[PDB]
Amino acid sequence: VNSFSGYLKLTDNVYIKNADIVEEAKKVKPTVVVNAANVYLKHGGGVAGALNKATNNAMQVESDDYIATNGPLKVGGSCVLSGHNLAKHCLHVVGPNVNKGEDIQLLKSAYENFNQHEVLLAPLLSAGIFGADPIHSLRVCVDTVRTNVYLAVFDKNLYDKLVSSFL
Numbered sequence: 001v002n003s004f005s006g007y008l009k010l011t012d013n014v015y016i017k018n019a020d021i022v023e024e025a026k027k028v029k030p031t032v033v034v035n036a037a038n039v040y041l042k043h044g045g046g047v048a049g050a051l052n053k054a055t056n057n058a059m060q061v062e063s064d065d066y067i068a069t070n071g072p073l074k075v076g077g078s079c080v081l082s083g084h085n086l087a088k089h090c091l092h093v094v095g096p097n098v099n100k101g102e103d104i105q106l107l108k109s110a111y112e113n114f115n116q117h118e119v120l121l122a123p124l125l126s127a128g129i130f131g132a133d134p135i136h137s138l139r140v141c142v143d144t145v146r147t148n149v150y151l152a153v154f155d156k157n158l159y160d161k162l163v164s165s166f167l
């Protein structure tokens with residue numbers, strides 16, 4: 001039993017809700033919140049910009065030190081950093097950005113990072129400003145993640161379409 005509330009159950013391990021991931025994280029304080037990161041951990045917009053804003057830019061400060069030490073992530077890769085005031089940990093995961101021409105096959109590799117964590121609050125990878133089809137992202141999530149994932153979908157219209165079209 002966990003404290004996630006109001007989710008629709010899609011499969012044995014995947015749950016979904018129309019919610020602002022920032023507000024969900026502040027309420028639940030999950031062990032792991034997933035960020036829709038880029039390889040430079042530049043949290044300018046989309047989910048990343050919103051999460052970073054909610055940390056008063058502390059996420060960005062920590063991220064800049066991480067990059068200065070380690071260099072950029074790989075597309076499809078991840079790193080674990082602090083969750084600041086939102087969660088114990090933030091798993092920064094880089095899905096392919098279609099608006100940069102990156103290979104959508106890397107979306108499965110991106111979701112594989114979730115399997116290193118027993119329970120996560122997450123957005124749909126590569127959705128939103130990353131330019132991928134969110135219906136496809138949900139399919140890859142369900143077919144790749146085996147740990148317990150609670151998906152927050154900001155857009156109510158999109159949430160309804162994801163549920164109604166889910167196979």
Ligand SMILES: CN1CCN(c2ncnc3[nH]ccc23)[C@@H](CO)C1
Pocket residue numbers: 019020021022046047050123124126127128129134152153154155156158
């Ligand atoms: C795939 N898209 C991208 C972003 N988005 C979010 N989902 C949850 N929390 C969020 N905070 C800022 C954006 C955002 C959904 C659309 O409302 C899904």
